[PDB]
Amino acid sequence: MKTKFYDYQGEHLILYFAGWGTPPDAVNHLILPENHDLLICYDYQDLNLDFDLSAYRHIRLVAWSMGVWVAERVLQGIRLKSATAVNGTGLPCDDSFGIPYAIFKGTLENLTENTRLKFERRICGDKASFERYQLFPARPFDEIHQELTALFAMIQQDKRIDLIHWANAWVSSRDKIFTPANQHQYWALRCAVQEIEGEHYVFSRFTHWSALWD
Template identity: 25%
Template sequence: MKTYFLHKNSQSKNLIIFTSGFASHYSHFCHLKSKENVLMLYDYSELDLNLEFKDFDEITLIAFSMGVCVSARFLKHINFTQKIAINGTNYGIDDDLGIKKELFLKQCKDFSLVGFKKALFAKNLDKAKNFYFNDEDYLKNELTSLYNLCNKQAIGLKFDKALLSKKDLVFSTKASENFFNKENTKIIYTKEPHFVFFAFETWEDICNI
């Protein structure tokens, strides 16, 4: 996977790690400001990560969509101050606790970027009309990589809060509720579509939900 610092502040000893969703690009989050350090993880077409975070006093995790299951597998060794999941579950792919396996496999084979954007942004599609995305073949490979991850790795990491869209068109809201209720995680609801980030101005706003 790739990493990108959305924000760097040498005066801050706090870090926000953002594990983004499938097909995300750092340019999608440029509107969000922060006084902290914000490191984004994205592009799961290859799944390897070797990072150390020794220079920070507090580390917050914000995990979005399939980034929730990625963080549960790759970041469970980090002592986070707070962990927030957004429209995703630790399982990622599961008939009851994530995206249904049959549906995910269909996306791996017949992925449509146009259809995905409609589900991702819904009412806010026009706001994202100039967003950068990799081509469909590249994204199919990323989906396959995520499918293999969800079928081979152990589940870990307990989230403190979960922000769920009431009418999520990517992750079933019911499946997310099933998972986080089982984990006794505090659930917060939003009327925003799957991509909730247009509703916020700063990363700190998300941390304070």
């Protein structure tokens, strides 16, 4: 996978796992706590994370959408200070616990630049939110298409769960991707759940990283 590393000379690390095909810039507006570096992880063509986590004292994970499933594999066996899921579950292609199969598979079967934009409208909700999201630099179509191909294969072949344990989960009330009922069904007996009014992309409602876990 790809990374973007921010050296703020921190003792601690915030680890952000992006959604499938999403722009890393979608979290630039979040203020970091003092004494924290940031590592943005994305482009899940594979699960290789070429980065040394060892120097950090505390590592806090924030994973959005399909990033939750990815983070469970990448960080299995790594001690985390906290792990926060944002509109994502351990079973991302799942009629009960994730994105319904018809939607997940349908998205890949029909994926074009045009349907990509329609899917981003579904992720963002209203037109104004969608248009704001379009100002983030878009990742190349061929890259996000290959990413979904890779994710689809991996997710179909590996339905393991609870590879790490989560501290809390945020669930958007109008999420049209991971439906709120499915998110609640997954997280109910696993971790604290925080409901928030919003859409699958909900980072726009936050100003500070730390609000996500504190």
